[PDB]
Amino acid sequence: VNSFSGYLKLTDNVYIKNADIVEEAKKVKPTVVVNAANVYLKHGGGVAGALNKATNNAMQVESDDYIATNGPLKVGGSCVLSGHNLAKHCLHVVGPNVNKGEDIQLLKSAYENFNQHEVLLAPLLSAGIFGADPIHSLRVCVDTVRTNVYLAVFDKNLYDKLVSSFL
Ligand SMILES: O=C(O)C[C@@H](NC(=O)c1ncnc2[nH]ccc12)c1ccc(Br)cc1
Protein backbone atom coordinates (compact mmCIF):
# COMPACT_ATOMS: atom_id res chain seq x y z
CA VAL A 1 0.00 0.00 0.00
CA ASN A 2 1.22 3.50 -0.92
CA SER A 3 -0.13 7.08 -0.69
CA PHE A 4 -1.16 7.94 -4.39
CA SER A 5 -4.84 8.67 -4.67
CA GLY A 6 -7.37 9.03 -7.66
CA TYR A 7 -5.30 7.21 -10.29
CA LEU A 8 -6.82 5.02 -12.85
CA LYS A 9 -5.18 1.64 -13.29
CA LEU A 10 -4.01 0.92 -16.86
CA THR A 11 -2.03 -2.28 -16.25
CA ASP A 12 -0.61 -4.37 -13.42
CA ASN A 13 2.01 -1.66 -12.77
CA VAL A 14 1.02 1.56 -14.65
CA TYR A 15 -1.43 4.13 -13.23
CA ILE A 16 -2.52 7.50 -14.68
CA LYS A 17 -4.15 10.71 -13.44
CA ASN A 18 -4.94 14.19 -14.43
CA ALA A 19 -2.66 16.10 -12.07
CA ASP A 20 0.02 18.76 -11.84
CA ILE A 21 3.17 16.76 -11.06
CA VAL A 22 4.45 19.62 -8.88
CA GLU A 23 1.32 19.60 -6.72
CA GLU A 24 1.19 15.82 -6.68
CA ALA A 25 4.74 15.76 -5.64
CA LYS A 26 4.37 18.28 -2.83
CA LYS A 27 1.47 16.21 -1.41
CA VAL A 28 2.84 12.66 -1.72
CA LYS A 29 6.53 13.41 -1.11
CA PRO A 30 7.15 10.33 -3.22
CA THR A 31 10.47 8.54 -2.96
CA VAL A 32 11.14 9.37 -6.64
CA VAL A 33 9.76 12.06 -8.92
CA VAL A 34 10.87 11.90 -12.56
CA ASN A 35 12.02 15.07 -14.25
CA ALA A 36 11.67 15.50 -18.02
CA ALA A 37 15.28 16.61 -18.31
CA ASN A 38 17.57 17.57 -21.17
CA VAL A 39 21.22 16.53 -21.45
CA TYR A 40 22.39 19.83 -19.96
CA LEU A 41 19.94 19.72 -17.02
CA LYS A 42 18.83 23.22 -18.02
CA HIS A 43 15.35 23.31 -16.48
CA GLY A 44 13.84 26.14 -18.42
CA GLY A 45 10.33 25.06 -19.26
CA GLY A 46 7.83 22.27 -19.44
CA VAL A 47 7.86 19.83 -16.56
CA ALA A 48 11.49 20.66 -15.75
CA GLY A 49 10.91 24.39 -15.53
CA ALA A 50 7.89 23.81 -13.28
CA LEU A 51 9.63 21.36 -10.98
CA ASN A 52 12.63 23.65 -10.74
CA LYS A 53 10.47 26.71 -10.00
CA ALA A 54 8.77 24.78 -7.18
CA THR A 55 12.24 24.20 -5.63
CA ASN A 56 13.01 27.95 -5.72
CA ASN A 57 15.81 27.17 -8.27
CA ALA A 58 17.61 24.77 -5.90
CA MET A 59 17.18 22.01 -8.49
CA GLN A 60 19.02 24.15 -11.07
CA VAL A 61 21.86 25.00 -8.67
CA GLU A 62 22.39 21.32 -7.85
CA SER A 63 22.13 20.40 -11.54
CA ASP A 64 24.74 22.95 -12.60
CA ASP A 65 27.20 21.48 -10.09
CA TYR A 66 26.42 17.97 -11.43
CA ILE A 67 27.12 19.02 -15.04
CA ALA A 68 30.29 20.90 -14.09
CA THR A 69 31.61 17.66 -12.52
CA ASN A 70 30.23 15.01 -14.90
CA GLY A 71 29.39 16.63 -18.24
CA PRO A 72 26.09 16.20 -20.06
CA LEU A 73 23.83 13.19 -19.87
CA LYS A 74 23.16 10.96 -22.88
CA VAL A 75 19.83 11.09 -24.69
CA GLY A 76 18.08 8.06 -23.20
CA GLY A 77 20.08 8.41 -19.98
CA SER A 78 19.42 9.60 -16.45
CA CYS A 79 20.90 10.67 -13.16
CA VAL A 80 19.59 10.63 -9.57
CA LEU A 81 19.75 13.93 -7.70
CA SER A 82 17.93 15.42 -4.72
CA GLY A 83 14.15 15.76 -4.77
CA HIS A 84 14.43 18.95 -2.67
CA ASN A 85 11.00 19.88 -1.22
CA LEU A 86 9.12 17.68 -3.72
CA ALA A 87 10.44 14.09 -3.19
CA LYS A 88 13.42 12.22 -1.60
CA HIS A 89 14.99 11.90 -5.03
CA CYS A 90 14.57 13.32 -8.52
CA LEU A 91 15.35 10.96 -11.38
CA HIS A 92 16.30 13.27 -14.28
CA VAL A 93 15.53 11.28 -17.45
CA VAL A 94 16.35 12.53 -20.94
CA GLY A 95 13.79 11.46 -23.48
CA PRO A 96 14.43 12.31 -27.13
CA ASN A 97 13.31 15.81 -28.14
CA VAL A 98 11.57 15.54 -31.52
CA ASN A 99 11.95 19.30 -31.92
CA LYS A 100 15.73 18.64 -31.97
CA GLY A 101 15.52 15.70 -34.40
CA GLU A 102 16.43 13.02 -31.85
CA ASP A 103 15.66 9.38 -32.57
CA ILE A 104 12.31 8.35 -31.08
CA GLN A 105 13.60 4.80 -30.57
CA LEU A 106 15.64 6.28 -27.70
CA LEU A 107 12.36 6.66 -25.86
CA LYS A 108 12.44 2.98 -24.82
CA SER A 109 15.96 3.42 -23.42
CA ALA A 110 14.75 6.47 -21.49
CA TYR A 111 11.88 4.54 -19.88
CA GLU A 112 14.27 1.67 -18.96
CA ASN A 113 15.77 4.00 -16.34
CA PHE A 114 12.48 3.76 -14.43
CA ASN A 115 13.11 0.04 -13.77
CA GLN A 116 15.87 0.93 -11.30
CA HIS A 117 13.21 2.31 -8.88
CA GLU A 118 10.38 0.37 -7.25
CA VAL A 119 7.85 3.25 -7.36
CA LEU A 120 7.91 6.53 -9.28
CA LEU A 121 5.77 9.60 -9.91
CA ALA A 122 6.47 10.57 -13.49
CA PRO A 123 5.40 12.55 -16.51
CA LEU A 124 5.10 10.98 -19.92
CA LEU A 125 8.60 11.12 -21.36
CA SER A 126 9.14 13.12 -24.56
CA ALA A 127 5.57 14.54 -24.33
CA GLY A 128 4.75 18.24 -24.12
CA ILE A 129 7.48 20.51 -25.44
CA PHE A 130 9.64 17.48 -26.33
CA GLY A 131 7.33 16.96 -29.30
CA ALA A 132 6.52 13.25 -29.22
CA ASP A 133 3.01 11.79 -29.44
CA PRO A 134 1.89 11.22 -25.82
CA ILE A 135 -0.21 8.20 -26.84
CA HIS A 136 2.99 6.62 -28.14
CA SER A 137 4.91 7.62 -25.03
CA LEU A 138 2.26 5.82 -23.12
CA ARG A 139 2.51 2.61 -25.17
CA VAL A 140 6.31 2.52 -24.77
CA CYS A 141 5.94 3.21 -21.05
CA VAL A 142 3.49 0.32 -20.59
CA ASP A 143 5.65 -2.04 -22.67
CA THR A 144 8.97 -1.07 -21.01
CA VAL A 145 8.48 -0.15 -17.35
CA ARG A 146 8.00 -3.09 -14.97
CA THR A 147 8.13 -1.14 -11.68
CA ASN A 148 5.16 0.82 -10.29
CA VAL A 149 4.72 4.08 -12.17
CA TYR A 150 2.28 6.79 -11.25
CA LEU A 151 1.89 9.02 -14.29
CA ALA A 152 0.75 12.61 -13.85
CA VAL A 153 -0.79 14.24 -16.94
CA PHE A 154 -1.23 18.00 -16.59
CA ASP A 155 -3.72 18.53 -19.44
CA LYS A 156 -7.21 17.21 -18.72
CA ASN A 157 -8.08 16.99 -22.42
CA LEU A 158 -4.96 14.92 -23.04
CA TYR A 159 -5.60 12.72 -19.99
CA ASP A 160 -9.08 11.83 -21.24
CA LYS A 161 -7.68 11.04 -24.69
CA LEU A 162 -4.87 8.88 -23.27
CA VAL A 163 -7.49 6.94 -21.49
CA SER A 164 -10.06 6.51 -24.07
CA SER A 165 -7.49 5.39 -26.85
CA PHE A 166 -5.56 3.02 -24.54
CA LEU A 167 -5.38 -0.62 -25.51
O1 LIG B 1 1.22 16.06 -19.33
C2 LIG B 1 1.37 16.71 -20.40
O3 LIG B 1 0.48 17.51 -20.77
C4 LIG B 1 2.63 16.55 -21.26
C5 LIG B 1 3.72 17.54 -20.83
N6 LIG B 1 3.61 17.46 -19.42
C7 LIG B 1 3.84 18.62 -18.65
O8 LIG B 1 4.08 19.67 -19.14
C9 LIG B 1 3.57 18.39 -17.20
N10 LIG B 1 3.21 17.20 -16.75
C11 LIG B 1 2.91 17.06 -15.48
N12 LIG B 1 2.92 18.09 -14.66
C13 LIG B 1 3.24 19.31 -15.08
N14 LIG B 1 3.34 20.50 -14.49
C15 LIG B 1 3.70 21.41 -15.38
C16 LIG B 1 3.86 20.83 -16.62
C17 LIG B 1 3.56 19.49 -16.39
C18 LIG B 1 5.15 17.24 -21.22
C19 LIG B 1 5.88 18.28 -21.78
C20 LIG B 1 7.19 18.05 -22.15
C21 LIG B 1 7.72 16.79 -21.92
BR22 LIG B 1 9.53 16.35 -22.38
C23 LIG B 1 7.00 15.78 -21.35
C24 LIG B 1 5.69 16.00 -20.98
Is 73 in contact with 41 (CB distance < 8 Å)? yes
Residues with CB under 6 A from ligand 1: 20-22, 36, 46-47, 50, 95, 123-124, 126-130, 134, 152-155, 158
CA 160 to chain centre: 19
- By most ligand atoms within 8 Å of CB, the mutation choice from 92, 124, 136, 156 for ligand 1 is 124
CA 96 to chain centre: 13
Burial class (CB in 10 A: 0-12, 13-18, 19+), 100: exposed
Confirm or reject CATH 3.20.20.140 for domain 8-165, answering yes or no.
no
What phi and psi, each to the nearest 5 degrees, are found at residue 145? -80, 130
Distance, CA 68 to ligand 1 centroid (Å)?
27
Distance CA 61, CA 108 (A): 29
Q: Output DSSP code: residue 7.
A: P
Tell me, in Å, the resolution of the deposited structure: 1.1
Residues in the chain: 167
